[model samples]
Target: GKQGRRFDAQQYLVTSAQALERHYSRNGLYPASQSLANSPYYSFSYTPTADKFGFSLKAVPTNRQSDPCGTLSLDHKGVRVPATNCWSH
Candidate 1:
């Protein structure tokens, strides 16, 4: 039960958010998919945009770890869908 929980998804989401921010600031564009998908517990994806000013990132449970906290996602400006309750630790 506890092993299948998704409490750590947000940490991955927020951690990547910061990394993306820093990489963007330095390189003037977001980094590669590996930075997001480099995980064992969670799955990830990256969306490409021509404008280079916006980006989307997602973290998905690789297994049945939804546990009411399912997927974690974020954008360039940090707009969170499933906005409030999903962020509970």
Candidate 2:
């Protein structure tokens, strides 16, 4: 039996990240690697676990820092603001 419109979370995340990277490339900014410091742009990180997968875009404030603002994620739960102590956990 076919369910009504199914969603593919993993594909969606990758494609969306691709689009974002393309946009950044067009703007002369790279977000796929560690090349910027205190950049006022969005950086992404994707993690796949055995039971759950997570995708997050972090707003970095220093050369090698992330979190404290503009942190969002999509996981088994849903999409929303991450925890304040998200960096710790």
Candidate 3:
């Protein structure tokens, strides 16, 4: 009987959220690593086509080679300069 009451659901959720945020922040990612499968934002879009309603997003960092600070030349040159020297090591 006591085993069934041993779980702390609130504590578990809080710890899980913090850990996920830390992981994403370190990798320079934007997903926040949460399970959005059930969220309306991930499930549908606010558009006229109900059947096609879904979230569309991209996670290209500012310093990313594909779109380096909106510099169109990066795409043509396939070149990337580190935003800062700290990223070089």
Candidate 4:
């Protein structure tokens, strides 16, 4: 149960990235914000930049979560920071 939580955060981060893109694909706009307000283990920064036409997602550890996995990003081009490991977690 303990080990699983941190691992879960990483996948959630990646899942949310695809989820956002899917939202944009249908509506032509990213959702307002899952800033969801400084949040839990992994906080998401969903800033729909350039007035929502372009966007990026950033995941930061807030009150909990792990290291090495650190911060991950998903850009408008769908390129992820440290794509292989951290993102695939």
TM-score for every candidate vs. truth?
0.72, 0.28, 0.26, 0.62
Q: Write the per-residue lDDT of candidate 3 for residues 1-89, one digit (tens) a residue.
A: 12111112212333444544465467644242244221211121111113322212211222212222221111112222233321111
User: Residue-wise lDDT of candidate 2 within 46-67, one digit each (tens)?
Assistant: 4434332223433323334333
Give lDDT tens digits, candidate 4, residues 1-89: 32455456556666777787788889988777754334466676777786787777777776566566577677777777767655555
TM-score of 3: 0.26
> How does each model score on lDDT?
0.67, 0.37, 0.25, 0.67
Ranking by TM-score: 1, 4, 2, 3
Which of the two, 1 or 3, has more TM-score? 1
The number of clashing residue pairs in each candidate reads 0, 0, 0, 0
The TM-score measured for candidate 4 stands at 0.62
> Candidate 1's residue-wise lDDT over 1-89, tens digit each?
43334456666667777888888989898765534544566787766467777777777776645345566678898887568776643
Worst 10 residues of 3 by lDDT: 40-49
Report how far off residue 66 is in candidate 2 (Å).
12
After superposing candidate 1 on the true structure, give the runs of residues whose Cα lies further than 4 Å from its correct spot.
1-5, 37-41
Query: Positional deviation of 82 in candidate 1, in angstroms?
Result: 1.4
- CA lDDT for candidate 4: 0.67
